[PDB]
């Protein structure tokens, strides 16, 4: 709904925010990339860098526009450009950041920045909460492996948001994706995991489609159980 | 459904068969094009190649086993990959080939081989049928700028089909796909001078969506009014 640089913003509840970042793809344009900002208390916590430095630098500053708080911390939900490839822009403000310790491991190889601290999980795939210290509302949830083997999932307690990254296609989406990181063998019980995790939430935000219903989780589970 | 190689053929009619090829693109993976395949008394005609040479190879293969009558031309949609990439097969097998003027202009710096035969449109955007010889029911409308600014469309005659080739997206489509050469202030315009070159058509066929009713037109106007 709202410009700011080359980025857009969209309010999806009264302290969460989508941010929404594009690259220029060969032969196809502009690629849409979302995240979520989020205001809790006096301090703004981030879910996802945008594809640049640049881009993200202005994500901080369209937060010291609008919401005019410090940002606490930011997780990244797995080592991809359009999840990671800000994280520069992140660190030279001074903001903690947070990721799998997959996402931080595999991160050089993928030519990203590794976030300063590393998420683990338990064997029902909930953070560990020590090394998730003081995420407000952040439910952090790590479903297994699917778009790639690192990617995590972030649910918004007090509201009806989930976020499913790169996992979630939404519910008219055709392939599901690029299928070279992809746990092909994995994807649909991956994805039927962050649906079991959040089972209440009811609009799925997603990083490459505007916000939809957990018909998202269930076609994209669909799709997968083909693969 | 029938497979020859990497290809697929769907029979929409008596004398019509959709053509389906995948190019396996960074971010979102394979991506399914359709062209059409028209028997005409003793002749076929193509409309769109596959995405590559060899693909193309492939359909015209298929044409030979399985219909066994010689392909008298090819009309090619606009110049982008996915509608000219298997030019160098159409002319190894020595098949005629007619694109828009325009497209043969775009195609060197789209990266394409133009076609050997340039059509020309007169002011209401019917094809001069002088440049376009013993086309048969194929009926060629250049509608305006759209998905690009070459963009053509090919109703059949005789038939309840017209392709829109990437003009047109489904009617339960999220967007408008490849606009990354659109023409967004034309776009609507000329998505709804297709509808009205074909006014009875009631089998919309496209590159990127199953083929769909006259609402995949409508829609697809709506979503291109909101650019
Ligand atoms: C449109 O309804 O769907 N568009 C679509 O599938 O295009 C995807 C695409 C990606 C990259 C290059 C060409 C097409
Ligand atoms: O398939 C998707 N989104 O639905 O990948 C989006 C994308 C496109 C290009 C580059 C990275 C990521
Ligand atoms: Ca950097
Ligand atoms: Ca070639
Ligand atoms: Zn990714
Ligand atoms: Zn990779
Ligand atoms: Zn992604
Ligand atoms: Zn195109
Ligand atoms: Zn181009
Ligand atoms: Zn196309």
Same mark, same amino acid.
């Given at each position: +709904? ?8 969209? =309010? ?11 690259? +220029? ?14 205001? +809790? ?10 594809? $640049?430095?640049? =881009? ?8 010291? %526009? ?10 990244? $939900?797995?080592?991809? %450009?359009?999840?990671?490839?800000? @994280? ?16 931080? %491991? ?5 030519? @990203? ?34 778009? $790639? ?20 296609? +939404? &519910? ?29 939430? &009811?609009?799925?935000?997603? &990083?490459? &489609? ?9 076609? $994209? ?7």
């Amino acid at each position: +709904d709202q410009r700011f640089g080359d980025l857009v913003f969209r =309010q999806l509840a009264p302290n969460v925010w989508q941010h929404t970042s594009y690259l +220029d793809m060969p032969g196809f344009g502009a690629v849409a990339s979302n995240g979520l900002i989020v205001r +809790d208390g006096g301090r703004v916590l981030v879910v996802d860098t945008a594809w $640049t430095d640049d =881009q993200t630098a202005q994500i901080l500053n369209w937060i010291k %526009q609008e919401i005019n708080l410090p940002v606490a911390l930011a997780v990244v $939900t797995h080592a991809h %450009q359009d999840k990671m490839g800000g @994280m520069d822009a992140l660190h030279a403000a001074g903001i903690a950041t947070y990721a799998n310790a997959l996402s931080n %491991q595999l991160a050089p190889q993928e030519g @990203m920045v590794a976030a300063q601290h590393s998420l683990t999980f338990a064997a029902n795939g909930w953070v560990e909460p020590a090394t998730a210290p003081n995420f407000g509302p952040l439910k952090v949830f790590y479903p297994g492996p699917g778009h $790639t083997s690192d990617n995590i999932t972030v649910g918004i307690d007090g509201t009806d948001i989930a976020f499913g990254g790169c996992l979630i296609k +939404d &519910s008219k989406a055709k392939s599901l994706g690029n299928l070279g990181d992809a746990d092909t063998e994995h994807y649909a019980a991956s994805a039927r995991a962050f649906g079991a995790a959040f089972p209440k939430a &009811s609009m799925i935000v997603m &990083s490459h &489609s505007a916000p939809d219903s957990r018909a998202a989780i269930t076609h $994209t589970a669909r799709m997968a159980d083909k693969l």
